[PDB]
Amino acid sequence: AKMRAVDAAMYVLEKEGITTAFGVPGAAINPFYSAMRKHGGIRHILARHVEGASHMAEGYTRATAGNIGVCLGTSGPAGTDMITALYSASADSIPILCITGQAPRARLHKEDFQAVDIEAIAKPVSKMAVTVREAALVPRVLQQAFHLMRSGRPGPVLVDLPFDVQVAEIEFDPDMYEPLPVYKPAASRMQIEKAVEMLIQAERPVIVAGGGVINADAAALLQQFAELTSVPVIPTLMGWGCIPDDHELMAGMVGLQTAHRYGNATLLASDMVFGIGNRFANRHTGSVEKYTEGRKIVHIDIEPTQIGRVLCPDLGIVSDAKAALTLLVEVAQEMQKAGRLPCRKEWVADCQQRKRTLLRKTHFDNVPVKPQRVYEEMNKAFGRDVCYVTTIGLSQIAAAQMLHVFKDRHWINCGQAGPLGWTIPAALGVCAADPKRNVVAISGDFDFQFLIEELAVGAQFNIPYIHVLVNNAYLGLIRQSQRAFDMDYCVQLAFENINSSEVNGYGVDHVKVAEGLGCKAIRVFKPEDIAPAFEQAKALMAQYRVPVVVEVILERVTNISMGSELDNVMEFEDIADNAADAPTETCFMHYE
Amino acid sequence: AKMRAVDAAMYVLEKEGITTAFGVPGAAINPFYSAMRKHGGIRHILARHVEGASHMAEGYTRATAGNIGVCLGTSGPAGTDMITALYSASADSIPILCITGQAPRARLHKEDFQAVDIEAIAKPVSKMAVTVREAALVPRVLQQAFHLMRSGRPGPVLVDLPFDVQVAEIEFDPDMYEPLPVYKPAASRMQIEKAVEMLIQAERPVIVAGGGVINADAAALLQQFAELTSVPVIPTLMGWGCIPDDHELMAGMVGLQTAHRYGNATLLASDMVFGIGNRFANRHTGSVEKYTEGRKIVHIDIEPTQIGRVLCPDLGIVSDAKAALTLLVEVAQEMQKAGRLPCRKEWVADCQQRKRTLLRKTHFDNVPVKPQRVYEEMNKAFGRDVCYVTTIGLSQIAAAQMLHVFKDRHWINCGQAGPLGWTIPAALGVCAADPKRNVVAISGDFDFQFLIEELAVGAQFNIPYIHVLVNNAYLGLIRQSQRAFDMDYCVQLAFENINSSEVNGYGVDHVKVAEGLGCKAIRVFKPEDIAPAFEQAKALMAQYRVPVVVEVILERVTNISMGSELDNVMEFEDIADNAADAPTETCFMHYE
Amino acid sequence: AKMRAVDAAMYVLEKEGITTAFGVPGAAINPFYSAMRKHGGIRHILARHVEGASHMAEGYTRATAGNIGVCLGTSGPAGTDMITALYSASADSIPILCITGQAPRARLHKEDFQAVDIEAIAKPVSKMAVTVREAALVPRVLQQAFHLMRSGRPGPVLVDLPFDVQVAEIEFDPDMYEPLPVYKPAASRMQIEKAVEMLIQAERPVIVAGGGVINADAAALLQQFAELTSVPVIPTLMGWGCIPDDHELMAGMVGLQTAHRYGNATLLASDMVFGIGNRFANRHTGSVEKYTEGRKIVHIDIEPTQIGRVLCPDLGIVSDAKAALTLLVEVAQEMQKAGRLPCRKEWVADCQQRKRTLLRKTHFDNVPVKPQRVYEEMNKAFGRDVCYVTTIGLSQIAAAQMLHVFKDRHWINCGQAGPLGWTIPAALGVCAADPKRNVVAISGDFDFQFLIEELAVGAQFNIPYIHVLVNNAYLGLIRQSQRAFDMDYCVQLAFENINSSEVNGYGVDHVKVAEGLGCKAIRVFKPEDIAPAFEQAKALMAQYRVPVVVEVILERVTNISMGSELDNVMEFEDIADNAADAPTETCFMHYE
Ligand SMILES: Cc1cc2nc3c(=O)[nH]c(=O)nc-3n(C[C@H](O)[C@H](O)[C@H](O)COP(=O)(O)OP(=O)(O)OC[C@H]3O[C@@H](n4cnc5c(N)ncnc54)[C@H](O)[C@@H]3O)c2cc1C
Ligand SMILES: Cc1cc2nc3c(=O)[nH]c(=O)nc-3n(C[C@H](O)[C@H](O)[C@H](O)COP(=O)(O)OP(=O)(O)OC[C@H]3O[C@@H](n4cnc5c(N)ncnc54)[C@H](O)[C@@H]3O)c2cc1C
Ligand SMILES: Cc1cc2nc3c(=O)[nH]c(=O)nc-3n(C[C@H](O)[C@H](O)[C@H](O)COP(=O)(O)OP(=O)(O)OC[C@H]3O[C@@H](n4cnc5c(N)ncnc54)[C@H](O)[C@@H]3O)c2cc1C
Ligand SMILES: Cc1ncc(C[n+]2csc(CCOP(=O)(O)OP(=O)(O)O)c2C)c(N)n1
Ligand SMILES: Cc1ncc(C[n+]2csc(CCOP(=O)(O)OP(=O)(O)O)c2C)c(N)n1
Ligand SMILES: Cc1ncc(C[n+]2csc(CCOP(=O)(O)OP(=O)(O)O)c2C)c(N)n1
Ligand SMILES: [Mg+2]
Ligand SMILES: [Mg+2]
Ligand SMILES: [Mg+2]
Ligand SMILES: [Mg+2]
Ligand SMILES: [Mg+2]
């Protein structure tokens, strides 16, 4: 039972579910790596940037309900390269576990090489950030970390391990180690009865299903509750997938950018928002006064201080989403056995009528290619079990408003922080979490470049997925936002590549870069070549077992639909009211 | 005089010396970019990672004495991508100015999209980190920022600008704006007299010249003081260059890794260390007890709290290095006019005797190439005005112990934090600071990959320099440190590149990657091909005006000399006692 | 259901158990006071110092198991006067709820009158410190606060309320409000079985019962477990009372100051410490190496990061003390039904032998009075249900080593922080928590003076108790500690009072001060007058219903027993081995 602190840490991590770790080793964290090798049972992926390792951990977590991605680094700048991910994870209410090396305790206040107060730096963007001050506390801090990462509003933790703390001997009985119970508040029968009593008197209600539903692993129950009450569902961007897109009750998405015309119109026509596992995000609502006008609000959240933060709800209930939905289904079934649930045939109908006339054109034959044609071809090329990974840009905004998803955790997106560079490592993290997952990523050229070297991780370790790269040689979104300032300034990436005429002054040759990094890559200039390229990509993945990049050369400037209010979203590109122009809407097409 | 806050900020920046800015735009920082374009006078370089923009700013600062590099970003994750650089700059006592966008004040505590408390996160690693709460304070916070960045111990500042603060109208008269006076403490005649009185009774004194000398722009005065007293000089890694390497009094460098055998032996033989503008860094001293044994210590620093932090000096004086050296020269000249400065012929002589027998072998004809042969060829190929840029690894340790530098700020190195990825952007920052500078960077393969995409910045904007890439398909330094743990684990980068046989399973094809990013690249397998490659590189730079990468394929495993104490440094590779094996030592060779 | 945020706060506070509040009003907190008056159901006590209000809350909490003392103040310096109490409460793992007023949100960063960042200041010494940013969050922050104050390791919370947030209208249904579930970890059968299996093979075991037992409301179960196993009990200072002092298994207290000679000897003779609800406090253990020598350690704590913080235990279990003791009793009962619990007659016997021979003399007839005679008279004068309140000094050290307590929460003492001035307000808070409690406080002259004005609270509101004041005109404890530095410097309070000869140059006339503040007071010069004085005090309380101070004039210098190690405690005053000298030891005297 006598043992190094880091050796005890391996028992804890194992009993606590960890089988994978992403990281970059260093002298200050070598004892940890030594204990991991001696113990076995954890697969280590070596990243080619610490930020990459961080975002891989995020993807690993977000892929499957019980998963906790682990990120490993040395002292000093390794810890400062993980702050963006801790922020991203905090912001979206999901956990990662960061572990950093550190100089010995005696030397923390002498300016020891690569010694920084990572504890103070990480505090504002984690549920806990702590420097472990005793060897015997190493297993206990991890014990406490897993409690915090699963309980209440989930979030990330950073553990900082001084060299001398790691290597010191402790007494530890791993047979005696017990994971702590997970804390979750639960709604009462009375509260839920009031909520359903309120729902039934609404003439035109909608359910807004947030990422909390997914966090609680409660997608089936949400769908069941909507079905029993016959109430249309609007998923948030983070709730996207918790009811399938081809379901009769899914009424679209709402907001300023990643939303549908029918979604916004249905919300503006509704007389109630039944919010479950959502907060009321800035870009979902616009001006709160407008979002709430003539409309009752119910809000169910696991976190007390998220209720009333942005708007004051008519009801507001503190509860885990699974517990609350279990009651909601039970209470709905009792209302149904009495004659107390109203028929909602008409309201459901005209929600669907909006859904098949208020569309956006995707079927463009133009050369150079219009980006909205790319998302049409993706819907056709990939099956219903597809899992999309993306970050930020005109690339992901248009993707969000034109792609379709049919299960929970088949849209992996850092919705609140959106750090460029996220997409590649996040994708790799999902693949490591589930080798059966049909992972497909979307990026613009700038996002693709930030952490482009992480493709070589996918090559070294054989982690295959498909990366769709839509290239306009622009910071697209920013160029569009600069219209209000009457300029086009510091947003172009184009230049004449002295080694590559083929790219026609678009600058970076992503095909050569991808191939040099050990991957496969295909470039597409014409819209009809997109479908064949995706089939080529699937074949290359199967034999070579590496990431395959499909680059599409876009027209330089395309303005994607968006606005500052729900009733104010601007359509720059062609709208559509029939299937010929928008053939991959779920109402017009059966998904594999 | 009525004007936007950001428009007033441009006047301040201009009057305060700024002509260059590195950044990545976004919606939250667009008003700033708008004011910059309207005003003119600042050259913007678009980076391809915010971290890249940050490290470019660091290089820009470090290149020339009055320079302040500026780093521009949006809200949220842009700010969290700059923390590593703020740390790096703080750690080495040098300033950068970071400016980030931010959500409006009314919405800072609602979870507004990409809104983070960057103020709290950046606090521990900057002299000031502040969110500007009023429009009229925008010019005043910048005014205060430049005072802090130049005064006392220099360090970096972060300014966080809420959207509504940027665009609000203020009254501002730019003709009335006055930069604040720079605060610097100065030594007294009495203190310096005591220091020189102490120096003259020392039998075997050495001067340890730190990065403070360079910070104060006092290299000429340091050399003059050493010459007048006839006292050998040991530069710290950060002081390297403040006396030329071929000077008769430069006795080498001291420490655990980036040091010379003769340097360590001279220090261990000395009876006094006269520390000017140094702190006594962990990897310079080893165990303080050993560094100080039988030896008197004088310590001159600008910062009171740096004196006595690691060891207690016999004297210790608070002063700017230029002011102190001006007195030291004056007092030395008075001692010389009397008969009071001792002759030090013998001590100087046997310092030089060590310097020409305690060497390390560089002239290896092996294939695959030994890294120490690369540094030999660099010394031959490049002129005396060469400016080296590097970060961390066996690549930079061996570079530090075998390359030679002949002027101050011709060794640009992040000595305390050493964040991987630093080298490329830092190099580009130096080039932007001085288009006449003969900039040459050294990286290992892992460092090169972290922020590899920033090469495309060098291509888009035409910023030429030479990047020497020493490739062993390894995390070299870490592999070496793992010897003590009896392992070789998670430190290899090698794989069979399915697109490139030429690289022989070394993994990433840096030539293809570099060319795809718009640059030129040459690969070298044999030692005799290195000299021609460097001449080819100089030609390519002149016509194409882009970064040129010279990749050298190294043998996989080479153990570089290092240890945990000055008397304990281990020589794994062949030592040398004559010029045939080490032909580029300054005593054996005249530098252009 | 439309209502001010402060009105909703009253519903929350009431449903959450609050019936009492201590405070000092101000303009910034007037809306709260207004809502409190309108709602009814909370008794407000006006303090005469905010610090007084804070410590009253602490006493109120500590008095009875479910109690949460509430402290109310204005903005600015009211909040900074509560930091000492937040620290004290945190330090001893007990909650108080502080509520402060604050300037409007729009003006928090303009230097608005009495506006301070209390959130930042209070963060390091509370489980939560928050400025409420929205009206609708007021009830939710309080909801979250009560969860934190009851769950895990209990601690204090500070809620900071901007004026405009208090007065704003919100929608709130109080019938729908549900207090959150309390989180507590619980031990498993397996873990407890291992602990009992370990205890059984110990030859000379001791149970150390800490303040966690009292916190968990598990005194009866602890006694029962000790009885079933026949294992002697050592309470910590904070665990004191959880087994009665006259119990046959209570073996005394251990430590450097508030300890018994028999307690220390028993512990040094033991071969195991079974720690339940204790941490291993600095002044309980001395050097950890000496405390653990030849001894096994079991440690049961509710907080993971308290286990291994000071020493590494042989077992260590994370659990609430009530849940753990329920299992321990169950498992003990099963061991007893088998023949598996050993007989411990001999070990119990010689623990009791120590307890009746290793004593300290208390029966002194000296004039001026020796302080140890005071505690003897207190034991005689007061019943078994007596409840002592004290803080720090030779006054409380000697009290702790000579008084006796017979139930849990009949020793109210701020053991980790010990802030001077605590005693008076703490006592008043206990009395407000329970008007049937026979409260008796002990102070030295300096402790008594810090917050002497709070006696007038006891007079204005009719809150009676007895305050024993032992007066030596000295900072006694500090004088004693200064012996090692060979001095007596800045520790005397004596002067010739120009209004009072009767005090003989002892300085402050506490009788005149107490009477002026509206209370009654008696002064005693001779030991035989102490008993009658206590009887007089009881009579005055009954009739006048106010605090009654009994001042005893001590000899100026008395050195109380203490040391830096358990085997190193020094006896300056006479020891004793018989009842004649120490007549109030529980084995010589029946209590009530
Ligand atoms: C360029 C860009 C444009 C965007 N445009 C839009 C847009 O138009 N419309 C839009 O909606 N979004 C958009 N987004 C995303 C948006 O910013 C938010 O990330 C998203 O709306 C928030 O989702 P949510 O409300 O479900 O909250 P989440 O971040 O998913 O979290 C909501 C709540 O879940 C709670 N919770 C956690 N666990 C549980 C549990 N187990 N049980 C119950 N509750 C739990 C948390 O307390 C939290 O308050 C955009 C993002 C970007 C990158
Ligand atoms: C892998 C690796 C190995 C290394 N090995 C070694 C090694 O073997 N030996 C070695 O020496 N270094 C080594 N270094 C670098 C080392 O860690 C430190 O960065 C370096 O020694 C510190 O330099 P310095 O003492 O001059 O202090 P600096 O960081 O340069 O600063 C010293 C002082 O200058 C003062 N100062 C600032 N401005 C002024 C002013 N105007 N006037 C006067 N004073 C001022 C500051 O207050 C500060 O205390 C290594 C680095 C790495 C990456
Ligand atoms: C002048 C002076 C001298 C002193 N001398 C001594 C001395 O001689 N000897 C001595 O022992 N003390 C002495 N004290 C007090 C001492 O400093 C500590 O306050 C005391 O030792 C702590 O007791 P404890 O171990 O029970 O810790 P506590 O402060 O009571 O807390 C212990 C543990 O309880 C846990 N806990 C909280 N709730 C629960 C729960 N529901 N279930 C399970 N665990 C829970 C916490 O996590 C914590 O780790 C002295 C104080 C002063 C003022
Ligand atoms: C670290 C960071 N810096 C800046 C931004 C602002 N960001 C938003 S989208 C965007 C442009 C991305 O362009 P690209 O990835 O090429 O996709 P496009 O919009 O052109 O489709 C930028 C710069 C960000 N989200 N993160
Ligand atoms: C962000 C970060 N992570 C990890 C480290 C530890 N780091 C020290 S040198 C090194 C290996 C670098 O190898 P390479 O750049 O290929 O050069 P080599 O040592 O092989 O010459 C590592 C991983 C660091 N300095 N910074
Ligand atoms: C705010 C504060 N300041 C200083 C101390 C140190 N304190 C320890 S006991 C003590 C002396 C108290 O003397 P008194 O209350 O007269 O009791 P005596 O020691 O004479 O019995 C002091 C000054 C403290 N606990 N708190
Ligand atoms: Mg990169
Ligand atoms: Mg683009
Ligand atoms: Mg390498
Ligand atoms: Mg007072
Ligand atoms: Mg006293």
Write up this protein.
Chains A, B, C: Its cofactor is Mg(2+); thiamine diphosphate. Chains A, B, C: Its EC number is 4.1.1.47. Chains A, B, C: It comes from Escherichia coli (strain K12). Chains A, B, C: One of its GO terms (cellular component) is acetolactate synthase complex. This is part of a larger assembly, with three copies of chain A (592 residues). Chain A is built from 24 helices and 21 strands. The first copy, chain A, is an alpha/beta fold. Chain A has three domains: 170 residues, Rossmann fold; 167 residues, TPP-binding domain (Rossmann fold, 3-Layer(aba) Sandwich); 224 residues, Thiamin diphosphate (ThDP)-binding fold, Pyr/PP domains (Rossmann fold, 3-Layer(aba) Sandwich), CATH 3.40.50.970. Chain A has a six-stranded parallel sheet with strand order 3-2-4-5-7-6, sandwiched between helices. A six-stranded parallel sheet of chain A has the order 16-15-17-18-20-19, sandwiched between helices. In chain A, strands 10-9-11-12-13 form a five-stranded parallel sheet, sandwiched between helices. In chain A, β19, α24 and β20 form a beta-alpha-beta unit. In chain A, α1 crosses α2 and α17 crosses α18. The longest helix of chain A has 17 residues. The radius of gyration of chain A is 25 Å and the shape is globular. Chains in contact: A-B, A-C, B-C. At the A-C interface, α7, α9 and β13 of A face α7, α9 and β13 of C. The site of one flavin-adenine dinucleotide has 35 residues of chain A, from α10 and α13.
